């Protein structure tokens, strides 16, 4: 499923991401836009044997089990396939753990390269939240 911008913003706000750990809703929508372009089915294989899954591109080496990643841990206790559903609940709950893992949102490289330090409030324009 491909979310509309505000549609995703509403979904995230509904799951408690607005201002979570001090990160405004705009930061999460911006991270989603550049990590997967709002596509819940987006996947990106990395050269280390792991793969990134879903709207927030969560990595299989430490967060979810896809059964084909060497020395992988499953800290979010879920199959990576669950991160590819139209319902973002699984992704959000896992993301909440990742953002509290000691690196803030720096865990998402696309957020760091395209959102960090910018006027993220723009990603929430026109939305009736």
Swiss-Prot record:
Tissue: In the egg white and polymorphonuclear leukocytes.
Gene Ontology annotations for the cellular component aspect, listed alphabetically: cytoplasm; endoplasmic reticulum; extracellular space
EC number, as in UniProt: 3.2.1.17
Active site: 35, 52
Binding site for substrate: 101
Disulfide bonds: 6-127, 30-115, 64-80, 76-94
GO biological process: cell wall macromolecule catabolic process; defense response to bacterium; defense response to Gram-negative bacterium; defense response to Gram-positive bacterium; killing of cells of another organism
GO molecular function, one term: identical protein binding
Record has Protein biosynthesis as a keyword: no
EC top class, as a word: hydrolase
Pfam families, A to Z: Lys
SUPFAM superfamilies linked to this entry: Lysozyme-like
InterPro entries: Glyco_hydro_22, Glyco_hydro_22_CS, Glyco_hydro_22_lys, Lysozyme-like_dom_sf
Top-level taxon of origin: Eukaryota
Domain C-type lysozyme: 1-129
Subcellular location: Secreted
Reaction(s) the record says it catalyses: Hydrolysis of (1->4)-beta-linkages between N-acetylmuramic acid and N-acetyl-D-glucosamine residues in a peptidoglycan and between N-acetyl-D-glucosamine residues in chitodextrins
Keywords linked to the UniProt accession: Allergen, Antimicrobial, Bacteriolytic enzyme, Disulfide bond, Glycosidase, Hydrolase, Secreted, Signal
Other observations noted: Lysozyme C is capable of both hydrolysis and transglycosylation; it also shows a slight esterase activity. It acts rapidly on both peptide-substituted and unsubstituted peptidoglycan, and slowly on chitin oligosaccharides.
Function: Lysozymes have primarily a bacteriolytic function; those in tissues and body fluids are associated with the monocyte-macrophage system and enhance the activity of immunoagents. Has bacteriolytic activity against M.luteus.
Quaternary structure and interacting proteins, as annotated: Monomer.
Similarity remark: Belongs to the glycosyl hydrolase 22 family.
Protein name (Swiss-Prot/TrEMBL): Lysozyme C
Gene name, Swiss-Prot/TrEMBL: LYZ
């Amino acid at each position: 499923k491909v979310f509309g911008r505000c549609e995703l913003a509403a979904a995230m706000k509904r799951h408690g991401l607005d201002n979570y750990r001090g990160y405004s809703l705009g930061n999460w929508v911006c991270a989603a836009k550049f990590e997967s372009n709002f596509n819940t089915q987006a996947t990106n294989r990395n050269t280390d044997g792991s793969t990134d899954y879903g709207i927030l591109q969560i990595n299989s080496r430490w967060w979810c089990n896809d059964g084909r990643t060497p020395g992988s841990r499953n800290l979010c206790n879920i199959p990576c396939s669950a991160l590819l559903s139209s319902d973002i609940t699984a992704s959000v709950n896992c993301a909440k753990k990742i953002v509290s893992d000691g690196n803030g949102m720096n865990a998402w490289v696309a957020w760091r390269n395209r959102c960090k330090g910018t006027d993220v409030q723009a990603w929430i324009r026109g939305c009736r939240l």
